[PDB]
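As noted in the main text, all predictions were made from sequence alone. Below is one such record, for Phospholipase D.
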Amino acid sequence: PPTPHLDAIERSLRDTSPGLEGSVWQRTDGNRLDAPDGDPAGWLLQTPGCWGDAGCKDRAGTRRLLDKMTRNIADARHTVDISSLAPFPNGGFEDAVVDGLKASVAAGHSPRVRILVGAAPIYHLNVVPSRYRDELIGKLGAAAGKVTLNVASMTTSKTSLSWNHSKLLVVDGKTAITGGINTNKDDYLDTAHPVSDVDMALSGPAARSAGKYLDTLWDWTCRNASDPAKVWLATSNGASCMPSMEQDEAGSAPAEPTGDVPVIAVGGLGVGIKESDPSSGYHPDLPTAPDTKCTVGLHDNTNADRDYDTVNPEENALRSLIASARSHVEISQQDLNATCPPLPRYDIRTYDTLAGKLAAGVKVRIVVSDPANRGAVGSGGRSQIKSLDEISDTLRTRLVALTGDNEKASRALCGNLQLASFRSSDAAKWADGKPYALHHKLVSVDDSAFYIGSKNLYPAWLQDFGYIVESPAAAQQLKTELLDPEWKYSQQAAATPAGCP
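Prediction:
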């Protein structure tokens, strides 16, 4: 079985970050999409999972995510590895950790547990690591004696806005859940307008790869615990920081297959962890002309930093995933554009790749979160755009900058682009009046290869992680459970680009 999309991404990643192969990105064979019995698409964890129901009475998707997290932790023999954006998991998220950990202890195990959150320099942490660690020890009751805890919150660059954005659950380095879902009860659980998001669950060698990525974050984090402006660290039972928990657990045995699925695991170290990949001979010709409509304040790591790319291979893995589309690509994001300033408006190479696809006849679908979600410049608006025109206009400028002609441009753009804001039912907004907020970080290509993870396509310099899966069978499951429904309701809010029928 040929993996033409994965090959191209592997080639881009080894040219970009060879030194990080085995830690920040790794391709593996023999994985299984970890679906339950009698539900072969159960590996895809959507929330809330209530297509066609503007009232969202039955959050079956939410239910499956929480049970699947509880079960994965209840099966823990040795290690539980959790990362997110702050806060530390609360609500039903914390319950899943608690109930799973008690179950594990009951089976006679002594689980070691790392819990890592990223916090922006602006953000005040209410429940701080030591308070959270006390809370877990509290809720675990008598089982706390057999649980080794490392709890940390981290910021890696205050002046370049970089902290952990990855969303991972890894057990025994054998199972991994990942996606866009932060362990935050107010966005997903206790809401009449819950955010639309998706995780995926699998097992096998690629779970260890997510384990090694977390070892890389925790080697930085344990070490920088000496700079308390960057790291707040709390352990339990007077325990060491455990910067190599996944490596210690994997030992010398290679990971064991559990299925027949080939995966590339891929992440980024953001800014402030590792300056460059010293083993890298990556030397791109960077986008020589950025856009008029905005000028970066900060130094532009997305469009103008070769080193940043060497320690953030996820950037080029997304570009290559899209570049590898031969027939069609679907893109389901919170945004393609970032708030500018401070951050650059968009990723030039990403747009030029898509523009190229439109010029070639490859069909491009983009569903982003409703611009009605937008606020100001930061925390409060789940849309960094004022209008979908800001996406299609940019595809025009790049298409023109490609074909010179503008008639070639409008033929490429108007003939091949679908652009819409996300809808999950017929109604334009939730029953309680708030708009649909879409938090997907999803790219699917030729119904063969797809990415599910935490890296948005819009510029952001955080630490992130995800899986790129090549599997026609699995991409068909993705198409059926997520993409086709998404378009069924989202085409109502489609936008015909400026200059077309």
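The longest helix spans residues 205-224. Residues 1-42+260-501 form one domain. These features were considered when defining construct boundaries for the mutagenesis experiments described in Section 2.9.
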